[PDB]
Each structure stands twice: as C-alpha cells, then as structure tokens.
Amino acid sequence: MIIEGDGILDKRSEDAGYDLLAAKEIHLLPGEVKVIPTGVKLMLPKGYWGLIIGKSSIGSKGLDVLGGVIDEGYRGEIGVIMINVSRKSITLMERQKIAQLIILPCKHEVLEQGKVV
Amino acid sequence: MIIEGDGILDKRSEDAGYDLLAAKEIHLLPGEVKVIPTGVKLMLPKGYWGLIIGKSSIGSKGLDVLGGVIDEGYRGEIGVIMINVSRKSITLMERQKIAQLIILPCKHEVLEQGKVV
Amino acid sequence: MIIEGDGILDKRSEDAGYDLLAAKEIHLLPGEVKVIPTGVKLMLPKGYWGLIIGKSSIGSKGLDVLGGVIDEGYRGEIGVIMINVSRKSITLMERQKIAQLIILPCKHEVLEQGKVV
Numbered sequence: 498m499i500i501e502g503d504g505i506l507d508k509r510s511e512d513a514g515y516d517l518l519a520a521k522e523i524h525l526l527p528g529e530v531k532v533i534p535t536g537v538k539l540m541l542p543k544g545y546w547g548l549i550i551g552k553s554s555i556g557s558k559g560l561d562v563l564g565g566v567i568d569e570g571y572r573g574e575i576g577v578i579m580i581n582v583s584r585k586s587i588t589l590m591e592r593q594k595i596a597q598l599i600i601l602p603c604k605h606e607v608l609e610q611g612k613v614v
Numbered sequence: 615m616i617i618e619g620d621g622i623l624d625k626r627s628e629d630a631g632y633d634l635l636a637a638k639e640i641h642l643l644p645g646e647v648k649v650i651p652t653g654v655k656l657m658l659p660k661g662y663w664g665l666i667i668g669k670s671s672i673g674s675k676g677l678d679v680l681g682g683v684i685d686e687g688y689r690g691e692i693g694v695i696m697i698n699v700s701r702k703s704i705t706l707m708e709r710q711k712i713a714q715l716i717i718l719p720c721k722h723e724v725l726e727q728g729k730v731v
Numbered sequence: 732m733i734i735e736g737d738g739i740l741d742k743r744s745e746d747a748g749y750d751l752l753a754a755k756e757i758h759l760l761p762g763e764v765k766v767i768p769t770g771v772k773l774m775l776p777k778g779y780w781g782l783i784i785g786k787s788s789i790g791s792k793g794l795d796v797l798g799g800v801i802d803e804g805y806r807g808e809i810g811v812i813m814i815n816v817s818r819k820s821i822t823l824m825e826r827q828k829i830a831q832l833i834i835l836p837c838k839h840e841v842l843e844q845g846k847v848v
C-alpha cells in the first residue's frame with residue numbers, strides 16, 4: 498500500500514503488524530493522555546481497516562493505547578493516543594517503537610429493525 | 615442483521631464500525647468504572663463476533679473501553695464497560711457516541727495437546 | 732492447533748475466543764502492572780495471529796489487558812500484561828479466567844513510498 502513518511506517499518510510476512518515510531522520525544526506524567534505523532538499517512542487497501550494496538554514492550558511499562566481505529570478512508574497523519582496509567586513518569590524517545598498497526602477485513606451489514614429472538 | 619433499539623447507527627460501507635450511543639447521562643470520577651447502557655440488542659451474522667472499541671473523540675478525553683467481545687450467540691442488551699483513567703471528572707451526555715462495534719470473522723481450532731517445537 | 736499446558740480451555744465453535752487462566756495467585760494494588768503467567772505455549776495456524784483481550788467479568792472490576800498481540804511465530808509461554816486501573820486492590824486466584832485469546836487472519840502489504848491523495 499502507499500504510505501508517506503518514515504515512521505512506519507516494513508514487517509516480515511509472518512508478523513501481524515507494522516511497528517509505528519514516535520516522531521518526537523514525549524513526556525507523560527501519571528494520568529496524562531497525549532496524542533503522539535508518527536509522521537505517517539497511508540492509503541489502506543480497499544476492503545480493510547487498521548487496528549492500532551500497543552506493543553508489549555511499552556505495555557509492560559504501564560502505557561495504554563486508547564481509541565485505535567483507522568478507517569479505509571483516513572488520509573490524515575496517524576497519531577497514537579497514549580496514556581500513562583502507571584504511577585511513574587515516563588519519557589518516550591524520538592523514534593521509539595510505540596505501537597503496531599494491524600490490517601483487518603471489513604464487514605458491512607445493513608441494519609434491520611426487528612425483534613431479536 | 616436484525617437489531618432492536620435506536621442506540622446504534624447505520625455506517626457507510628467504507629466504515630469499519632457502527633457508532634454506539636449512551637442511553638443515558640453518566641458521570642465518571644477519576645478511577646470509576648461503569649457499565650454504560652446503549653439500549654440495543656442484536657443478532658450477529660453466523661460466522662462472526664463483534665469487537666467494541668473506543669472512539670478517538672472519547673479516548674482523547676482519557677476514557678477507555680474494557681472487555682469488548684460480543685459472541686455471535688449474545689442476545690442481551692449491549693452495555694459498554696468504560697473507565698475514566700484521566701485525572702478529571704467527565705460527564706457523558708445521553709445519546710453521546712461512546713464506542714464502535716466492529717464485525718470480525720470467527721476461527722475455530724481444535725486444541726491438540728502436544729509439544730510446541 | 733498444538734498447545735502445551737492446561738491454562739487454556741476448549742471453546743464452543745460459536746465462541747470467538749478461548750479462556751485463559753491465571754497460573755498462580757496475583758495481587759494488584761491500584762496502578763500496578765504485572766505480567767500474569769498462564770503456563771500455555773502454542774503453535775498458531777499459518778496465516779493467523781492471536782489477539783488477547785479482557786473478559787467482561789474482570790473488566791468490570793477495573794482491570795485492563797495491555798499489549799495483546801501473539802504473532803504466528805511465537806513459541807514462548809503466554810503471559811498476560813494486566814493493570815489495576817481501579818482505586819481498589821484486587822486478588823486474582825490461581826486458575827481464575829483472566830482473558831481470552833481470539834484467532835484472527837493476517838494481512839501482508841508491501842509498503843510503497845508515494846504520495847497519499
């Protein structure tokens with residue numbers, strides 16, 4: 498797929514997702530939420546959406562990823578919403594791997610008002 | 615698919631998920647977890663399950679969605695488990711968009727006790 | 732699929748995921764993150780990855796699952812990264828169901844540097 502930016506790395510065919518990198522150093526105090534810039538824009542393949550999920554390396558530090566849905570039509574830069582849910586202050590260095598983008602298939606169902614049985 | 619209730623909106627074919635709406639006003643203090651009612655019941659299509667995930671608009675306020683698996687067989691009303699992980703009190707207004715329901719395919723594997731190599 | 736260990740249970744064909752069990756009693760104070768051992772190792776089927784997600788029963792207690800991606804190639808024991816984001820201390824008993832493993836398909840896209848339009 499077409500991407501713009503160097504904040505996303507090539508993955509092995511066997512890997513489920515692509516690593517995403519912090520475009521700049523971020524400091525997070527306990528309880529702080531910040532939208533971390535990655536500098537990448539992309540064109541997701543038709544029929545799919547992207548799921549942003551946290552890396553185990555950073556999750557084990559007590560940092561979570563919030564939100565996380567990139568719709569096929571999104572064309573803006575990708576920012577990752579992160580919160581420090583631990584009781585310690587953390588510094589994310591520039592170009593540190595902060596999350597992963599995983600491509601998943603889309604399913605459209607029409608909604609029919611009825612009576613669930 | 616068959617649904618009952620007006621707490622879920624039609625999505626564009628290109629969107630990955632359907633927006634879910636709070637059935638009533640909810641107040642969340644820092645650290646509080648509450649199960650927010652949406653008023654909708656549904657019949658998921660055979661072969662799929664539903665993933666409830668948070669909206670970026672609310673995730674950026676420091677609210678997270680916990681749990682989040684709706685099995686094909688679930689027939690009860692959908693409630694979203696939300697926590698305020700920020701250091702500020704938040705009020706969710708009635709019929710505010712609080713999360714998204716995304717339909718994903720099911721995979722059944724039999725479990726074979728062996729030796730992973 | 733081949734698994735080793737008794738910390739994972741057989742699921743009904745209709746269920747989206749398999750329940751994962753704590754291999755030992757864990758105590759979590761508010762704000763603490765711990766990697767909970769399950770004792771299981773597995774060989775995921777080629778073409779898929781596994782998503783670890785939290786159970787509604789434990790999510791409603793204010794416990795979250797962080798990280799959560801098992802790549803097809805992972806051969807080590809599965810540990811679940813959990814945090815107590817509530818304001819109350821919690822004890823997870825040995826062999827308590829703490830999360831679910833859901834098998835999802837893999838999608839590989841080559842990355843092409845271009846201009847997103």
Ligand SMILES: [Mg+2]
Pocket residue numbers: 561562678679795796
């Ligand atoms: Mg979370």
